[PDB]
A = this chain, B = another copy of it.
């Protein structure tokens, strides 16, 4: 049959712990060749991992996630966006205003702090407030963005990451062609993240006026949309707007070719793609 045997599922997990190669593409003739190559790639993975750690101690740099955030934010500031920073705590009434109530499945993913406050699962509740407040101070476009941790329970959503860093940009204000405005903003982020080549998926929407999803090799990377949305009235928003949400850990993982999504972000086991324990 020829080129039949791949790495086993257990072999893949062992290789990915310290290594960042693409081991799921290797094919082999028989079990002996697989085990021989597995032994060699495990040794290379562990040795390459040790070299990278010593390279960081010898020549430290900014954290890869913090570097990713600075590169995108500077590009968005240069595009006229205001960087805002909102608290991680949001109120139960803010969640309810987002239709985040019970028997709605997202409610079970929410980390509750007390009876009245919770960890934000998304940046939309606070961004809604800042959008409306800035409309009172200008009649031109309201262009804001925030990068910050969001929290969702793993055992109700998958997602693999309970804490994840989101980037959400918003351009509130009527546009002659909000789609081109959206695609230009996505291009600004994707080039600044170091991922200039990607795929766009444009579909008409039920709740929004138009959605735009960004793909890289079939992987979901960004979900954008053109307003209005049926939740705009609940937040005293009554004008067109376009926005885009980016998972920054997911962007960093794809750019740096990390084998899992838990290596580039916040961790006590990993540091910039290398396992320190």
Chain A residues in the interface with B (C-beta under 8 A): 50, 53-54, 56-57, 60-63, 65-66, 70, 73-74, 77, 80-89, 111, 113, 119, 126, 129-130, 133-134, 136-138, 140, 142-143, 148-149, 151, 162-163, 265-268, 271, 276-277
Contact = CB atoms under 8 A, between A and B. Distances in A.
Q: How many copies does the complex hold?
A: 2
A51 to B, nearest CB: 10
A127 to B, nearest CB: 9
Contact of A85 (B63, B84, B277): B63
Nearest to A147: B66
B88 A62 contact: no
A47 to B, nearest CB: 13
A163 B90 CA distance: 12
B87 A137 contact: no
A134 B143 CA distance: 42
Contacts of A62: 73-74, 77, 83
21 contacts: A53-B134, A53-B137, A54-B138, A57-B140, A60-B80, A60-B83, A60-B143, A61-B83, A65-B85, A66-B85, A82-B271, A85-B266, A87-B163, A87-B268, A88-B88, A88-B149, A88-B266, A133-B276, A133-B277, A134-B276, A149-B149
Contacts of A277: 129, 133, 136
A66 B83 CA distance: 9
A61 B85 contact: no
Contact of A86 (B66, B77, B134, B268): B268
A37 to B, nearest CB: 27
A136 B20 CA distance: 21
A111 to B, nearest CB: 6
Contacts of A130: 268, 271, 276
A136 B50 CA distance: 10
Contacts of A63: 83-85
A86 B137 contact: no
A271 to B, nearest CB: 6
A108 to B, nearest CB: 13
Q: Which 7 A-B pairs have the closest CB atoms?
A: A60-B82, A63-B83, A85-B266, A133-B277, A133-B276, A87-B266, A53-B137
A60 B88 contact: no
A137 B50 contact: yes
Given A88-B163, A130-B268, 9 more contacts: A53-B134, A53-B137, A61-B77, A63-B84, A70-B70, A87-B267, A129-B277, A134-B276, A136-B277
A126 B83 contact: no
